[PDB]
Design a binder for this molecule. Structure first.
Ligand SMILES: [Zn+2]
Ligand SMILES: [Zn+2]
Lengths: 153, 310, 310, 153, 310, 310
């Protein structure tokens, strides 16, 4: 029973789980993917330590389930994240991220002349890589850029 | 149906070496006996959001030699009064209901592609969008190089001018790498030269490419001399004048031309190619611009005929 | 000859419920099998003194699906240099000699009517004049409401926006009172609402009409929701913003729509109708704008064919 | 408390928390009134049940003291909110919303013709109350609108 | 020890019953025994981003008269309209280092305010900032009412024209309620009637007010008939006719007029006040326009100096 | 006995190590115990054929301040552009008979020079003559560097932005090499890198210089970070994005900054310097802008008088 030190969080019953969200990023996906328009319990592990990780993030949601595709799309916003299927206080389904080739509706084209600004359209950046930059090719202006660009203003 | 039937012709990087063959083949084949009522009882649109009467003129001209009807506009700037919130998205859904195949030019990069997502049934072409593609201009260029060189592979391409922002050379250079051999020579100022953009992929497919400063070097060893257009408002007057003389053409340099060679230019011209050149047989630009009707006729032909017999 | 043959189509208050029936009937009937050479060997004019490429595009498009030729202009403002004393009166007498049927748009109220007095033999249409009529726009509206509602009488009309200066609602509202029943609901700001102008005569013919402030009231009880266009330069920014939210449309309000209902808009749009609406079946505006070709084809058909057989 | 049962709500240290946030307003807050831009333990129970028949949102922020004024800026959006001074599971202050003579930084002036829209400054309206309307007059253009009118889009 | 030194003048509500009362007293004195080298060595940047000659000319007229000199501009387009360019804050910061005062006129509500937050110690005044404010005007109207009746209290004021949007007309009232006992008559179309909220402002201040259909009624007791130019702009081309029929002012209407009565107008008048009037007694418009000077004259003097020995 | 009386100011190279050294000393004095009626009865024609408010406003601000008055103009189109009209020489001759001095701004390299050959004894100064010169600027930058560091020698200067075409940026260097011991860092895109010939100018003067990829490096030792507005104009619409990513300046980059360091910029800044900066310590831009005054103030005083008792 009650021993030496009063620790912290335990495992909650069920829903989606993605372990390891980088420094100041939880909100980043929480907003870029708006994981709040869900009538299910959105508990959000924020600003808390993880081993030696002085600061880590972790969304916690009941009844929802990250789709294989959802998992691909965050692999450029959280590389070392980890999706899994949590079943009644017992996790299963090791569905961690993995960089996709498509990426939808979130990023913005740095090409000021691209039409993806005025017209209502789905943002579409193809995904490839060098060895320091993940080349995101535009679906509309067809212009090659890198992630170290598109993820800014 | 035909490989390229009702298939939105938007970017050359989307077309394929087979489609390309089909297109050019149709072009020349159809260049023998035209049917002045092939797309009869049909209406083509011609939405020229950005004006441009060479590409407008030709397209509407091709449209007619094919017995089609054209409705549309050549919008300029006195209609800046349009700026108000009527989006192209709606402009196209409306327009899509009236016709069969849209032909459009637009100032922003993403034109043609974007209307595609609001026209569907109505297959659209791209007369030029932003500083992206102009599939039609590379088409007439290609077909023309064939007609003259006889072959479309293992050539000696020379490209002079503003290779940096010159969208007519990026699109041609791409499409040419779709064939074997084709030796590439670039000739542009040291701040207007080709970008590593196309470069890398050029090497990637073992496409021999080179770079020089004076046409007068790569002259005895060339087949197609594509003259781009170096602009004054692209380089400060002083430098423009300086880095210009050897980014121009004249009859005096063609002196040792492989008779088998032709001189082209996407057009128009102003400083670049001198008129004495207008005589020496290498001069093919004006004729090249005549071919633009056929490559454009066929473009629609396929896009509008489930199958082609002729 | 046909009831409406070579009969200047100028104002809806001049057309008649029978003519209207003929028109719409022709429209749909002709909508089944078009003759891409009905008015063959013929030339139609298209004098667009005031620019407007939706009404220009459609008309010239209808003109072509009927195998006719079109000559004309889409005058803008860079030709303000025209202002000089060349009167429309002469502009029409000259023009009248060249063709068969004139199609015109003009900025001053009295255009089409006035040319009539200088063309005669040459029957003219009215693509919109001043802030008076636009017979063609009410036509496509009507025919469209028929096509969808099945019937053209005993409907639940809803009209939102700038009903005060919105000439597309006065002309429709008139023409609808030409049928029995049709329950009218107005929805405009308290300074953009319908004028006693149409109102009085509305009562006069025992036409049940009403007025509300929120679409969300008259929603479960409506059939055709005609969205007009409330303009910014018509009401001061502050108020415009204020008296706007409940003079707009969204999918969230259509939640209890009689499936039998459709949402229309004379077009274009900008703030009014949101895009989520672009999906819910009530969304008919774009399709409505496609019908504009037929109501317009028939308009000429009759105006040009002594008799119609088909 | 063994009635109709579930099991969540948990306080965790010396930190000022916000308990009782209306449906769909939690995360809302986090972005209008900048709460997440911090580096001290956060546990967000968006969509968590409460002992008033309703499950709502919970924003737990440890390591922060929010001025009575800051509290007032929550009003309009999240109504009868509550922010309590908490030290070692013990409470040292119960703060509830009131209406401040001035709201700031978040709201967008509706008047399209307002220098506000194209200049490096910040939104500063004014607050007034009338029967069914909470009035807000922009300090810049001087046009008074309504709570819904400004708090919509 | 004056209250206005190194302070700003932006809105009217930003002033007081005695603030005005000071300003005006100064306005009279400066008109009596004028101070010419009052602002010697000082510099005032009259910035009219939105050109406005009459409101400009005068302000500077005062400036120069007062021994001061000007720096500044009319219109404003460093290139085009609203492109990627300099911000007002930035324009305003730099300008504030070299000038001693700042008088700007802008077409965006709150520009003058915004300057406040960036202009350092330089007191900025407001010549006109959109439908928002225009202090100096209301000031010259006011002081002129004093120059005429002797008292700002117990006046039978009347305001005709476009009260709804009329910028001079909301502000005058706001300021006249600062005084004791004033009966407001509102003779204007119901399409341009007094903006509600202000009606409350008067209701809650327990001020005597009412609306009217045709001027004739109040002409008797009204000691002030401040006219408003109903710019044909805001209305439909035809609408203007039906109303602007009585909301004008021929000297033939004058008759009833109280001997002290005077006709005021912010100008410029086109159709509002008839030419017959110009030569009659109550014609006081241009005088109000010329009197403006001393308000601004005084104002700048009360803004630029600690104490003033009159 | 001052060197600058009745002499001209056109290019920077047309000046000296002590010329500047005199001008600046004057710039300080005039800032200390300012001479207001210095140029009384004098007249200076500020001729801005190419409008330029900020460069204009100031020059005149100085002028007026110094007891002098102005005659002149903004923009220039007696009719249209470059038609058969008056020549600059002719404009310049007539204007030189009635004014006492001439301050012009033109868009053609050497206009200010050309005025020299036709303007008689009237000393002409240069406010900007195309990509050629702009003396007063380099002067205000310079003096401001003195106002800040105390010394023009031994400075770790750094210039970011568009060095290639940046008119303020070539000239500053030219002038700073006139001083002893200065290390120049060139942090700018390789598409807008320092114009070669100047690199030689420094190489041959045995001046310490070098280029850079990302500011971060030099931020440590740099006592001056003079920024340059990379006008999106010269670049491709997309290109701007890839570079203008680090060639900006958030206060977050500042940190390393030496306590004496200051950020300079000719203005107007759009994206170059972040708003965070405005309120930090090293923010010195607007001050540099306001300090301009005294340079021009001094300058005109050193141009218009034989001797000056300070
Ligand atoms: Zn793009
Ligand atoms: Zn505002």
């Amino acid at each position: 029973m009650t021993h030496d030190n009063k620790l912290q969080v335990e495992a909650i019953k069920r829903g989606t789980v993605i372990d390891h969200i980088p420094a100041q990023i939880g909100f980043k996906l929480l907003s870029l993917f708006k994981l709040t328009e869900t009538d299910q319990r959105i508990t959000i592990g924020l600003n808390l330590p993880s081993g030696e990780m002085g600061r880590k993030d972790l969304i916690k949601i009941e009844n929802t389930f990250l789709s294989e595709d959802q998992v691909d799309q965050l692999a450029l916003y959280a590389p070392q994240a980890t999706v899994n299927r949590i079943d009644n206080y017992e996790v299963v389904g090791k569905s961690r991220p993995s960089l996709p080739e498509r990426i939808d509706n979130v990023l913005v084209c740095p090409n000021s002349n691209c039409i993806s600004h005025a017209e209502p359209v789905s943002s579409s950046f193809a995904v490839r890589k060098r060895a320091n930059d993940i080349a995101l090719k535009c679906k509309y202006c067809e212009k090659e850029f890198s992630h170290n660009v598109v993820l800014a203003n | 149906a035909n490989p390229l039937y009702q298939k939105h012709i938007i970017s050359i990087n989307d077309l394929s070496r087979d489609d390309l063959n089909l297109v050019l083949a149709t072009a020349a084949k159809l260049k023998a006996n035209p049917q002045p009522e092939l797309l009869k009882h049909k209406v083509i649109a011609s939405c020229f959001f950005e004006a441009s009467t060479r590409t407008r003129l030709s397209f509407e001209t091709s449209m007619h030699r094919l017995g089609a009807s054209v409705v549309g506009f050549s919008d300029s700037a006195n209609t800046s009064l349009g700026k108000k919130g009527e989006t192209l998205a709606d402009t196209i859904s409306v327009i899509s209901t009236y016709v069969d195949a849209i032909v459009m030019r637009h100032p922003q990069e993403g034109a043609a592609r974007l209307a595609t997502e609001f026209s569907g049934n109505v297959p659209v072409l791209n007369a030029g969008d932003g500083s992206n593609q102009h599939p039609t201009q590379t088409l007439l260029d290609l077909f023309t190089i064939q007609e003259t060189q006889g072959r479309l592979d293992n050539l000696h391409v020379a490209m002079v001018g503003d290779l940096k922002y010159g969208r007519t050379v990026h699109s041609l250079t791409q499409a040419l790498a779709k064939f074997d051999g084709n030796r590439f020579y670039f000739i542009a100022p040291d701040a207007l030269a080709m970008p590593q953009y196309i470069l890398d992929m050029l090497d990637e497919k073992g496409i021999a490419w080179s770079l020089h400063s004076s046409i007068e070097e790569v002259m005895a060893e060339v087949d197609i001399l594509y003259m781009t257009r170096v602009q004054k408002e692209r380089l400060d007057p002083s430098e423009y004048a300086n880095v210009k003389a050897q980014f121009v053409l004249r009859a005096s340099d063609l002196h040792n031309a492989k008779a088998n060679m032709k001189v082209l230019h996407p057009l128009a011209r102003v400083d670049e190619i001198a008129t004495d050149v207008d005589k020496t047989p290498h001069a093919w630009y004006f004729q090249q611009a005549g071919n633009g009707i056929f490559a454009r006729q066929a473009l629609l032909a396929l896009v509008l005929n489930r199958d082609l017999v002729l």
